[PDB]
Design a protein around this ligand. Structure first.
Ligand SMILES: COC(=O)c1cc(O)c2cc(NC(=O)NCCCCCNC(=N)NC[C@H]3O[C@@H](n4cnc5c(N)ncnc54)[C@H](O)[C@@H]3O)ccc2c1
Ligand SMILES: COC(=O)c1cc(O)c2cc(NC(=O)NCCCCCNC(=N)NC[C@H]3O[C@@H](n4cnc5c(N)ncnc54)[C@H](O)[C@@H]3O)ccc2c1
Ligand SMILES: COC(=O)c1cc(O)c2cc(NC(=O)NCCCCCNC(=N)NC[C@H]3O[C@@H](n4cnc5c(N)ncnc54)[C@H](O)[C@@H]3O)ccc2c1
Ligand SMILES: COC(=O)c1cc(O)c2cc(NC(=O)NCCCCCNC(=N)NC[C@H]3O[C@@H](n4cnc5c(N)ncnc54)[C@H](O)[C@@H]3O)ccc2c1
Lengths: 343, 342, 343, 343
């Protein structure tokens, strides 16, 4: 019911329909960075799992629970709300781990868990880290976490950096200018050009890019999953002050994220940065409505305010200005309707 | 409401949310074969519109209503349930047609019209013709049609033919082969092999192909929109008997459709066949989990059974057998989870 | 009871020696200029190892190797052959006026009796993967006639193995077995035999040549020193391996080839069947994995190839390979007596 | 048993190992002429199977038994001596036909059947019809056949015809002349040229061919499987008198066969003639050691004598003369070492 109160029915239906497909599980499993890093984090921190209780929030096919089993976990509660729970049950049975892994179909906010656990494992990251709003289910699950327990991942760092991409910015108007013709099959479409521009600029661009478009060291906003409450994610204000390393027109902000698995033996990092091999998270770019010229040495400052909505996503408000000149820009984007541009 | 009772709210939300985007409207309008053919059908049959009352079911941005206006329609009621209705109204005003195009926001099953109409126009065809279940709304609108009124399009021909395409079969078979792995990172996935194959082959393959892959002349199934009732599209049974022209493996059936605008001046055809230029409908192929072998001269008999679901799509059942040998193939597909391949 | 018959199902020996009794088979072996030319170079260029020496030719066939020893100046060559090709060898010895130097002795080297101990043994005991046909044991068995200072031509044999990637080959075999998926072949459901078919097809070693760019790591080498090895050594051959992957991608199996060296007194002459060398009538051999292993460049692929000699003059092979980083293991059986000739 | 007395233990081992491979069953099942005609013959004569007792001699995977079940047979005893019998049992179970099909592992000469049968079905044809000597097992099975029972196939027609193929003839001496060189790597091989020629000419050529190489209407030799006895096939004398339709050199005799399923409703034919689509029986050509010139209208008379051997094959003796000139030729061939020439 915590989940229910913060989610529209129609959004939850699709959301779990999407993750009920084995083709989707397979896509996530075939991401070697994602899968290998989760395995290393768990196996290389075996003392955090050996003979321990484990909670797996949104286990999907259950791959992370088998890794926890490989590390010697005594008992693992694997919670999954989609129909994938049935397939996870099959793998538990076929891998002779019914005594160690128990699949619980349902949402972690609603299911009954019998005991407190020593550690919670999960993959609740979406685009820009926060999209899909499952980090709140991850943090909600800490009601079953012993005091002094641990979280895998333990922290999440979202990175923001200004970028220049003249061709991406102009692409928006080339597409919108379809409407700027007085006789499309005899019809004057011009009146809708402004609405088309507005529509395109509300879409965060999901794809990857050359790191040479980034004009400044990124700014990092950290969520400590051991300390955070799920309420901390309803409104996420990310201040930024970029020390411009390059001179040129800034067309928007680029987003990626890292997560760290802070175990007793070592810390393992999973990065979706553009300096690292591409993942199924890709990167995310939000354009300013107008570009801001910035010289190397200038400071570009502002805030990125993420306001959670009931569509399991966020409304993104970005305000930015070049301090040395006062030039200002902004944009308001809907993270639930991104434009998949990757080629 | 008829629409609400046959549709899960969840599906309707996304459905109308999808067609409320100007980018989607642009994508459909830039299909020149579609837009140019609809304009030809309408303008070439201008006498079917001159001083006539028109209903445009699901008008989107209103392009079809403007065509009706260009052809001389006295008054056009343009119904649209998505938020695109407000954009259409903007275009009506900016094109100075307020006296002839009247946008009516809402579902055609729910709104009220002040008068009966002489002709209904619409673009209700989806993948495989029937996907998205909008033909039922199109036929539902006939409650507003005068006796002996016309419909544009007037009929719809679904074509189906067996094909051979080893690449396609192996491509989908290979994906499903991921779940045979006995030790993926030390995990036995083999238990879920059967479920993966089932899922992958339930997906209709949406794309185009060279006509050379077809192993027999197509079988036609015709829906006459002037006669069909919307209840007719709840359960669609298409029997087929193919006379094989080439020997080899039949990996499935290929689907496409044509619609005809039977006007008073001339009949105009809109075809999505693989012999014709590509459209945003492409073609659709249903794969058999196991290919059937046949020799030239054999007959391939069976039935394609389409049952409409509450998600605005169809549950597909394809039974096919080679009569000469008794080799049978039973297949089930989920038109709501296609594989966009092109 | 002779050593040969004790270890050989009589049904296999009759077929085996009938195969080599045909003159067409001798022609095919002799027309391999790499084989025949290299054997002659190893003998003639180490002539002092033969001049006025006693020679044993094990499995002489038509006798070509005995004639090479005679060209090098051997005092006496005992040419042992168990097939009916022995009679043809006698004809060539007479027609080449070498009756005073080449003495054909029909029978099996395990069963015949020689008049004297010999200085050097010559033979072509190599089959596919070096070990197929189990003739190396007859070669090693013949050392009962070898003088203390004796020598063996070949002297050593190097088995090479390396992981390869070859999607076409894997699909080709996987497609053949797909025949047994059919639920209604002429109205008959064959699907219950699908697993048995794939097992059968993937037990077949692929006798083929290939481009070296399919290999994903440097080859591992297993050496057999024919001077030191005992006949019993080849009943169980254990080959461990630890490959350092040079390329990322799917590992579809292991490729095998072999080199032998004629370590003479004047020089060592090498006969190589490697894919980097001209093709021979041994080709190369690949053992496919029913399920390919994914590995990344820099990962380690480790395991063991174990050959257990059977009564059909061949080996039952088990290949267990695992990607160390992830625990992805592949276990495979191969019947070296049912090869798939792909060439 | 009768089988063990007429078969060398060694030949049998290899024989049943060959048919124990699913890949071999698959190849026979994929011959659409073979599989499709057997199905048509059985199904279109359903009254010969409806509520009838059936014996399937050498059922392999069991497909012919399944056709007999499709035709409504009450009880089918499917006898198979290879290890394929275990796979046939798996298919009977998975096809829910255990109530009507009983797989009996073993040789039809040695197993015991619980009752007599109404009809025997089998695929006993080899190359030249008689190769592999399976027809004797087929006839031997008639000890279980009721009086006035039927056989499927019922009869077999072997067709002989003289052919001209200069290039096939000359191909034999091109291959054998490899031995006709005085210094192959310093060795004089010429003494074995005659033996190499002999060996090549003793090989029946398994191949297909354009029907235009035939020079006279074929001659037919018929075995009636309802009347013939096992011993009738130990010595098969086929006289022939060809009336040459074309002038030229005759290089040998071509062989093919038809079988007829004489059912109650109709007769169905399975033909392997060179005018019909190719089957896995191909055709067989036996060369004359010396060709014979014949004018159109001349008469080529002679005999083909087939003598069974314990290698499950036949020694072939062919003598032929042109009556108008007395020109004569012979040849002795061994049907167990055919030359597979098709490509
Ligand atoms: C409008 O349309 C669009 O344009 C659009 C909109 C979108 O949002 C899109 C999103 C996509 N997705 C994606 O980016 N995929 C790649 C990144 C890897 C993500 C890996 N992590 C993850 N999020 N999995 C969580 C697991 O936990 C389970 N779970 C969740 N809650 C619970 C709970 N309360 N109790 C138990 N289980 C729970 C879940 O069911 C699931 O199994 C793709 C396409 C999209 C397109
Ligand atoms: C696997 O991934 C998925 O999950 C997935 C699965 C799928 O099946 C997908 C299928 C897609 N399909 C497509 O490509 N579509 C565009 C091309 C054909 C355009 C043909 N034109 C047409 N039928 N337009 C309807 C108009 O009529 C209006 N309307 C309708 N009813 C009413 C009513 N009762 N009252 C008033 N108005 C109404 C509507 O709002 C709208 O304006 C795309 C994406 C898909 C993604
Ligand atoms: C389709 O799949 C199959 O069914 C299949 C399966 C197979 O394994 C197949 C194998 C093939 N063979 C081949 O070419 N492989 C490559 C080797 C190149 C040639 C290397 N030469 C050699 N092996 N030397 C033996 C000589 O030494 C004599 N000998 C032996 N022991 C003794 C003894 N105790 N005393 C005296 N003499 C002895 C012998 O009689 C002979 O003269 C072909 C086809 C095959 C097909
Ligand atoms: C030596 O190297 C060569 O040069 C060579 C020599 C050859 O002769 C070769 C021949 C080949 N073969 C082929 O392509 N033939 C074409 C037609 C195949 C149609 C099937 N014909 C058939 N005879 N199958 C009988 C079935 O009945 C089973 N069976 C048999 N007896 C009994 C019994 N007493 N009780 C129960 N079951 C029994 C058996 O196991 C089997 O299942 C290929 C390669 C060859 C190569």
């Amino acid at each position: 019911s915590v989940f229910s109160e913060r989610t529209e029915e129609s959004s939850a239906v699709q959301y779990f329909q999407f993750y009920g497909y084995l083709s989707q599980q397979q896509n996530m499993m075939q991401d070697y960075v994602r899968t290998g890093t989760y395995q290393r984090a768990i196996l290389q921190n075996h003392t955090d799992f050996k003979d321990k209780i484990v909670l797996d929030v949104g286990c999907g096919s259950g791959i992370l629970s088998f890794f926890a089993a490989q590390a010697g976990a005594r008992k693992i509660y694997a919670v999954e709300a989609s129909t994938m729970a049935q397939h996870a049950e099959v793998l538990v049975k076929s891998n002779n781990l019914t005594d160690r892994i128990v699949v619980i179909p349902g949402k972690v906010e609603e299911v009954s868990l019998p005991e407190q656990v020593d550690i919670i494992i999960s993959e609740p990251m979406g685009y820009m880290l926060f999209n899909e709003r499952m980090l709140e289910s991850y943090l909600h699950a800490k009601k079953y976490l012993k005091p002094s327990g641990n979280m895998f991942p333990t922290i999440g760092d979202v990175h923001l950096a200004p970028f220049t991409d003249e061709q991406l910015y102009m692409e928006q108007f080339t597409k919108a200018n379809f409407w700027y013709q007085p006789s499309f099959h005899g019809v004057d479409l011009s009146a809708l050009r402004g609405a088309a521009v507005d529509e395109y600029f509300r879409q965060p661009v999901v794809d990857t890019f050359d790191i040479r478009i980034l004009m400044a060291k990124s700014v990092k906003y950290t969520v400590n999953f051991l300390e955070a409450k799920e309420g901390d994610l309803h409104r996420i204000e990310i201040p930024f002050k970029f020390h411009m390393l390059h001179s040129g027109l800034v067309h928007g902000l680029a987003f990626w994220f890292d997560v760290a698995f802070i175990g007793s033996i070592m810390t393992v990092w999973l990065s979706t940065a553009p300096t690292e091999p591409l993942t199924h998270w890709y990167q995310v770019r939000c354009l300013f409505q107008s570009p801001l010229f910035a010289k190397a040495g200038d400071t570009l400052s502002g805030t990125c305010l993420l306001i959670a909505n009931k569509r399991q996503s966020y409304d993104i408000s970005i305000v930015a200005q070049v301090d040395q000149t006062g030039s200002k820009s902004s944009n308001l984007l809907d993270l639930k309707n991104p434009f998949f541009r990757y080629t």
